[PDB]
Amino acid sequence: RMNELKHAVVPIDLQSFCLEGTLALWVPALENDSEDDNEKLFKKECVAYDAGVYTSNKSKGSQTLRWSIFQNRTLTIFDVSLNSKKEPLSKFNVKIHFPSNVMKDGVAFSFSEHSDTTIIYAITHARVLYYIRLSKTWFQLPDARLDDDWCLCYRPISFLNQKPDLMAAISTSEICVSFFNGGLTKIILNPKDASHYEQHIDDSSYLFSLKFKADYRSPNTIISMIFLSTYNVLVMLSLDYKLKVLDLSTNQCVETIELSQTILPLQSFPYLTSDHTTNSFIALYYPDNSHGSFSIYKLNANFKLNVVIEKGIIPPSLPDDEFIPWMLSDFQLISSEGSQSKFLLIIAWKSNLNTVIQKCNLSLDQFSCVWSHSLDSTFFDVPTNMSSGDISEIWLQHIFAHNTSIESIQVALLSFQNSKNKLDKFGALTISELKNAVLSSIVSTIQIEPNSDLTGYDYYEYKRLLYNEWERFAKLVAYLDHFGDEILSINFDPSNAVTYINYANKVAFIRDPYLIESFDEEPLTKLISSLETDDPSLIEGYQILDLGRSLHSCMSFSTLSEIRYSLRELVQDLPSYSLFDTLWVFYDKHIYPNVDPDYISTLIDTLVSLENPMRDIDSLIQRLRSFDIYNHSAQSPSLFLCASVARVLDSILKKFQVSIEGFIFLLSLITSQQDYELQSKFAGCDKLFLSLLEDWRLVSFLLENSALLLEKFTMEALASVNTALQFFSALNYSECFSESQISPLHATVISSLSAIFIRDDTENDLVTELVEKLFLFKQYNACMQLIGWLNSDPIAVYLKALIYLKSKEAVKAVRCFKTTSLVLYSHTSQFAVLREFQEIAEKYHHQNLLSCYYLHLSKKLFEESAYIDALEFSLLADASKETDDEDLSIAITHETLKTACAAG
Amino acid sequence: NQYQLPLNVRPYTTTWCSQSPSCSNLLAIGHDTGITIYCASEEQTPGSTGLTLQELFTIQTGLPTLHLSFSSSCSYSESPVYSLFLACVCQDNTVRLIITKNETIITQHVLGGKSGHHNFVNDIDIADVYSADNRLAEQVIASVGDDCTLIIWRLTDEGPILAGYPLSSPGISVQFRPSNPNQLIVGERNGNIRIFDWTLNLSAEENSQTELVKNPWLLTLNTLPLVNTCHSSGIASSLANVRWIGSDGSGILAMCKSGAWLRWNLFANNDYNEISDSTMKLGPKNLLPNVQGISLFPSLLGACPHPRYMDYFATAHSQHGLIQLINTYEKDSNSIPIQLGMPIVDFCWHQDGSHLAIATEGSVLLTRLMG
């Protein structure tokens, strides 16, 4: 048994982070500064060659920043904080331009307690050292103010003859830099006069414990180094496999250990890391013939410091196809504070653009290793019905919901036209403009031809050629964007619970699969092998689920699209036929023509063989929708959190929808069979079916929210978010109050899922709740797009009316106004759309409520300049009184005057 | 210069009988309790040209008529008797064929229940289909609704055959191709325009063997994504309507709610040829609109194409009583020949293109325009 790891991926572009723009900066210029095509353009501009995330773990609260460096002489910084702050939202990233490329391993961070500022050390290929002070303002406010002293430039003397190779920030004024051919300097800066000096470090390893060319490398050359605290200590590994402890208080080597011997070059990767909790443990990597092994060491301090061993070997599991090579990219180490017996080692493996992440739970026997890993790796016929629209609609949806970067689309778009200038021009396009530009440019290249006896067009050929052009474009986009999938680094964030994974144009984090995920991806055998169990109905439930899965897989994209339109119709207009007439019609139109007679018989017979199948799937369906609830939070989530949650939700909801559909298909098949014992075994399945239809509804509703782009003109994120699903995500923002080791990411997802599936008579409808909030935030288009999901409850119908009213659909609004009443809702607190009605209801002592409603309507139609209806409702308010109230009578006749006069 | 007449009942829609030659001079107003028929009489007693409206009678249905279209089966005879057939949409989401002699309804054929629409019905059209000879073989009613469905209702000698086709969003406008009643156009709310042949599946595949299916969805034209050449930032606009242009349905006019309109010249402006002479020598073209612009005002009701002159359409600012006459051709010369100072409910061209009929909240108008 080996658990699976999954990740949530977010592209590093403005759109995915809900950013409004970029603060562009240029470092001060100095004297010796110094220094096919579309694919190279993408690579040069958008595919980072180094990256990481730094957490300022002591601020209020922590800022978590993701840096990347590109061959266009830039360093970009994105705020990737998952925790809520007391601060304004990050609506901007920063892009810093350099006269020369920042070197690999040439970016280092440090944080000052006083003045609450983050520092970046950067070294370019030209060997200039830059000292950059970050203002939080840069991320928050447009065209932010630059302090004069934001960038200081240094030209260290040791850089003239020696090539800087690795860095380790010691503090906000001190940094160590090791050299490629050997040696180590400490650069010490005085930020308050722009001057500096160095300290030559002699690598004074007096003793070690145990048991010719101009281009040439000394055995003491640093090949990996890390800074620890509150030991003023540097831990270094040498070219000749010596583990050294450097005391930074005295600049002397205090301890040295010779390690074992093997050839280690010429692949370049980190060899050392320390745990983030107590800088006291050290993980160390040993290359092998087969992936290597890992050691852990304890650091003991009294002056004299000891590096005492704890582990000789931690052997990684096999990466997949070992006739192609795999290289270590990076790794992290985490001890669990309780106490120094339990450790966690996260490892990232690289093979060109392929990647594997492994976790190891190691523990001490006074050892055991529990391992987990990630198993990381589209077509449709020309539409014959319009349930999901035509070729362009479908391809456009697919390309823009694919989790590829915006840049890959922009660069791909260039190729489908006639230019570095043009790329920057596309960057000033809105996402909708980009979508339109993609569609426009594809539609413009495809020509429709006459056929055949010149009696019309060849519609068939047009469709095929249009499809193929879209396909080519999608292939180019995926091809370019896949270069951005190269792994570069990983970082455990102790401030959050989270380990960040840094790709060349994407950030990600590790997560456990939810049950629904395990049940989606194959096969039945592996599902069964979950211990022990060793009983039905556990096994038998699984078996029936697979029957649902395999039935679902009988349907093509085109059939599925028709089925979802039928299910939509079923759950939006629930009254028409009886329950079991609908199942029969459904089976007749959608299942029967798609499912083979033998396969029907196969399902019947295997279902009959089960002891109480209905109970079994009932229980499994209960398991799948079962979710804990975390504490709902106050207040604001970061935008990045909302984006992250939305992506995971979209991914989970798709598996839920397919799962629910499989069961619906199954129930529909069963209840149409002329087999007494089968149907006898499912006698009261109507409640199960209705329950599934309700699940389907909410899930499919939210899936429609995923691609729904919001209009642009406490909980600040609600007004700055980009999609309807991110908006939903923000409303369900949640934290684990008792436990820190759980991130607000996992809690928000879980809470959101809980809100979807945990049901009762007393609760309000999720559609009404979400749409009502969108309305309050003036997202009228979103609302209108989603209006067909709102049910027949009075509040819902009233809200349908308000949405139509706002959409200039007066006649539809008025119709909805007259087929509902707010009479039972003069007390309800939950919906702020009810305030205007409830103010009137309170004014008139919750009496004559019909009239109050008609009065409210009158004033509402009046604001929208619908004076005829405002008049009629006023007359209706007058006609509707049941109890004497002079104040109400007066107010109504007042409104009548006001309304009649305005209509003429 | 223009005729006016007050209304006792609140209107919703106005249409001209153009489908029946002998009734080409009457106007229907769909309103709160039914349908009032008016006659356009050429008479003006002082001795001049100038039409007037005579309120003939009111067909009481007991509920609002929202959309309406005259049938060809409409006739006049001699007590003088108007024998009318009306394709109607009513407040209860029903689609109806209403049969009358004057005010009195002999029979209503109602499409509702399971087979009808289950939400607001936005548009309706009727067309005549002729068999082997020029005999009247079928009458066809098409309707589109917020239930994202196109419903075809065929009235055959044998009786009714109906079919429903899913749409990707609400269906806001539907129209049979003039002179080619087997093709129709549907405009969805999201701006996608679809040409649909309701015919090519029943003739070969549906009625018998050997069930070799053809795609009835001939073409999708995209509207919203292709605007901006004039010129709208239009923060999420939607389709107001789409219309066939020309007595042969050679062109297509799409109007967005923002005022942004687009024109395609798809087919030859001619009785026989489908391929336009223009396509024949300059080569196959793409499906980008040929010309586009933006009205001065947002267009709630959409474009009202001139029944005779292809390049001309009218579009109103419904709330403020302005009607702009647009010539597609003819870029940036702005003409607002009609300004009323009160809301417009609906308007349509006189069957002969001389006049406009306009319903406001309190009156119906006839307005002549020249050129």
From Swiss-Prot, chain A:
Component of the npc107-120 complex which consists of nup85, nup107, nup120, nup131, nup132 and seh1. Interacts with nup107. The gene is nup120. Keywords: Nucleus, Transport. One of its GO terms (molecular function) is structural constituent of nuclear pore. The keyword Transport applies. It comes from the Eukaryota. Functions as a component of the nuclear pore complex (NPC). NPC components, collectively referred to as nucleoporins (NUPs), can play the role of both NPC structural components and of docking or interaction partners for transiently associated nuclear transport factors. Active directional transport is assured by both, a Phe-Gly (FG) repeat affinity gradient for these transport factors across the NPC and a transport cofactor concentration gradient across the nuclear envelope. It is found in: Nucleus. This is Nucleoporin nup120. GO terms for biological process: poly(A)+ mRNA export from nucleus. Its main location: nucleus. It comes from Schizosaccharomyces pombe (strain 972 / ATCC 24843). GO terms for cellular component: nuclear envelope; nuclear periphery; nuclear pore; nuclear pore outer ring. Coiled coil: none annotated.
UniProtKB/Swiss-Prot annotation, chain B:
The keyword Nucleus applies. It comes from the Eukaryota. GO terms for biological process: nucleocytoplasmic transport. Its main location: cytoplasm. SUPFAM superfamilies: WD40 repeat-like. Keywords: Cytoplasm, Nucleus, Repeat, WD repeat. WD repeats lie at residues 121-163, 166-206. PANTHER family: NUCLEOPORIN NUP37, NUCLEOPORIN NUP37 P37 -RELATED. This is Uncharacterized WD repeat-containing protein C4F10.18. It comes from Schizosaccharomyces pombe (strain 972 / ATCC 24843). The lineage of its organism: Eukaryota, Fungi, Dikarya, Ascomycota, Taphrinomycotina.
